[PDB]
């Protein structure tokens, strides 16, 4: 599953025509596009590799 969530503050004067406003005109833009399942799990580093990345010298 994919979750696309948006949050922000919109001035009720930049809304143009068909109730549409570009995200660049929204203050406090919070945009999340996350996924689940093994497809998302395959994009995680892995505990040992993450530890080496954060601690291993060079």
């Amino acid at each position: 599953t994919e979750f696309i969530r948006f949050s922000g503050v919109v001035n009720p004067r930049t809304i143009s025509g068909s109730n549409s406003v570009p995200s660049t005109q929204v203050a406090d833009a919070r945009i999340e596009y996350v996924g689940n399942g093994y497809i998302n799990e395959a994009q995680n580093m892995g505990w040992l590799q993450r530890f080496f990345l954060n601690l291993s010298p060079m």
Partner: protein, 58 residues
């Protein structure tokens, strides 16, 4: 000058070369909607804004 008493031969050289340089460039091509923080005495507005984006894995 009967012998090599006056016979003379000499050479000398002195070469020096120094160089130096430095560069610094930066670019930014975004658009961000900010919010007023306070109104100054002269009418200038203190604007602060923030936007968080979670594409995936970070």
């Amino acid at each position: 000058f009967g012998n090599s008493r006056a016979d003379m031969e000499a050479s000398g050289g002195n070469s020096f070369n120094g160089k130096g340089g430095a560069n610094a460039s930066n670019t930014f091509s975004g658009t961000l909607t900010v919010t007023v923080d306070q109104v100054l005495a002269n009418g200038n507005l203190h604007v602060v804004g923030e936007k968080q984006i979670a594409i995936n894995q970070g």
